[PDB]
Hints:
The structure is a homodimer of 48-residue chains. Chain A is mainly alpha-helical and 48 residues long.
Amino acid sequence: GSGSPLAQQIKNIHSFIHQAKAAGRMDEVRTLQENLHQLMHEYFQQSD
Amino acid sequence: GSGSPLAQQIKNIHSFIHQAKAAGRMDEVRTLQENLHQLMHEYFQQSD
Ligand SMILES: [Co+2]
Ligand SMILES: [Co+2]
């Protein structure tokens, strides 16, 4: 594929984590970290 | 690609975060999250 949709979502969530910290919303940071974790599982597949 | 040496380091650090959490070492989780953050900046060539 040429869209790299998951890489784009990862980049966005990364940015959103810094923004939530800057807003004083560490609660939102936690949820976004969980979201980033899931995306990393989708993107970085464990493989032989 | 997702199989580069850098991707392997990301996979490793990700696993180490789970292990540190299991050990109750949230201090180590934080340091490892900072390391993951840097690797993601390298891999996705993102700036803050
Ligand atoms: Co995981
Ligand atoms: Co960053």
